[PDB]
Amino acid sequence: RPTFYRQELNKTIWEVPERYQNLSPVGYGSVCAAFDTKTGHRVAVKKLSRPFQSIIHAKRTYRELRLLKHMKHENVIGLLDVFTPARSLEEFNDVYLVTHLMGADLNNIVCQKLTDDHVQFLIYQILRGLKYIHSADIIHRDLKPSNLAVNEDCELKILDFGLARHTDDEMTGYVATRWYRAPEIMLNWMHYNQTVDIWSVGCIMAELLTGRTLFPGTDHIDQLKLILRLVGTPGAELLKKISSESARNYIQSLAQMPKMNFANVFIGANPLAVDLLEKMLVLDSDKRITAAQALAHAYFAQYHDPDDEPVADPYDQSFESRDLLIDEWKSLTYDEVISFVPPP
Ligand SMILES: N#CCC(=O)N1CCC(Cc2ccccc2)CC1
Numbered sequence: 001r002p003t004f005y006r007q008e009l010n011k012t013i014w015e016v017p018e019r020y021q022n023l024s025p026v027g028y029g030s031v032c033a034a035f036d037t038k039t040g041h042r043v044a045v046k047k048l049s050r051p052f053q054s055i056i057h058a059k060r061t062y063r064e065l066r067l068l069k070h071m072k073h074e075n076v077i078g079l080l081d082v083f084t085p086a087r088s089l090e091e092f093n094d095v096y097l098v099t100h101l102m103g104a105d106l107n108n109i110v111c112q113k114l115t116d117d118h119v120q121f122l123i124y125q126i127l128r129g130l131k132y133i134h135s136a137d138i139i140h141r142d143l144k145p146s147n148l149a150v151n152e153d154c155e156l157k158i159l160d161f162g163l164a165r166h167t168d169d170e171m172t173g174y175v176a177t178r179w180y181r182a183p184e185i186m187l188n189w190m191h192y193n194q195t196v197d198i199w200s201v202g203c204i205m206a207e208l209l210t211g212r213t214l215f216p217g218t219d220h221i222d223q224l225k226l227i228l229r230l231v232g233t234p235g236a237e238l239l240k241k242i243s244s245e246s247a248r249n250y251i252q253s254l255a256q257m258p259k260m261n262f263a264n265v266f267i268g269a270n271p272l273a274v275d276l277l278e279k280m281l282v283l284d285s286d287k288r289i290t291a292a293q294a295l296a297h298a299y300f301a302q303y304h305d306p307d308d309e310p311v312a313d314p315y316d317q318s319f320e321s322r323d324l325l326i327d328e329w330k331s332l333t334y335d336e337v338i339s340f341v342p343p344p
Pocket residue numbers: 026031033044045046068097098099100101102103104
């Protein structure tokens with residue numbers, strides 16, 4: 001057990017191992033930047049807020065820790081350390097998580113339009129991380145520019161996985177929290193799968209090429225109209241797959257529209273980028289290109305290396321179907337904290 005020291009930082013008591021120095025607030029939980037004397041990295045340290053205050057909150061704490069312990073990929077957020085000052089389960093109350101310090105997201109780098117070579121490299125890295133995530137049967141569910149960390153060398157990491165249901169008010173109105181969401185999940189058309197993340201990549205790619213949000217709807221229905229104007233109204237094949245009869249009825253109330261010509265929307269763009277966008281932004285989620293397929297698309301010929309695009313170890317999510325008490329979720333979390341093995 002390392003030696004811990006205490007300090008108060010913006011109305012919060014922090015107790016951390018001596019290896020972490022020069023703590024400075026940067027902003028669920030509270031987050032500080034620090035210097036890790038063991039590895040030489042600048043790191044981000046997150047102290048969880050009220051991790052075991054309800055059943056829902058205890059299960060969410062366990063969910064996040066299981067996920068972060070599993071993700072080991074250059075283009076995905078990973079765990080450098082996890083610790084608690086408690087010396088036993090009976091006194092266990094706080095959880096701290098440590099990862100690399102990531103001070104900028106895709107927004108801060110990019111209302112701006114990038115060169116085609118930058119777009120190739122950034123989207124390639126998102127898809128390389130997604131092939132890894134999807135290989136473990138994980139769905140991110142909330143891909144958007146603010147959830148993509150980028151550094152000075154244009155290197156990218158995916159973070160802030162969907163860990164809980166978003167509130168109804170969070171998704172209301174003219175908000176970027178909804179603009180990158182696949183239509184089938186935005187309107188609850190059907191049981192969704194990993195293809196929802198590819199829709200989000202297409203929205204992000206279009207915005208990097210044009211400098212403009214692709215579907216900036218003022219509400220759910222205005223956004224659906226923007227989407228159907230570009231990709232066309234559904235035919236009977238897709239309508240049958242929409243399980244809600246009321247959502248089916250609404251769609252059939254709309255005047256039919258053909259798919260638009262994407263070369264006349266993304267004027268001047270690389271024709272290979274135009275082709276890839278057509279394969280991502282397909283209304284029927286069964287027919288969208290997968291991450292593994294997209295990495296082999298000719299747009300990425302300068303970066304694609306099939307021997308350097310790894311998959312993940314399998315990931316057991318059976319706990320999601322389990323109903324447990326607060327103290328049981330808390331004891332599972334304690335076990336995962338003390339069994340952590342740091343990376344090389
Ligand atoms: N500067 C700044 C922000 C920053 O460095 N990033 C965004 C916030 C996350 C928080 C976090 C920490 C540990 C485990 C999971 C999540 C860290 C990376």
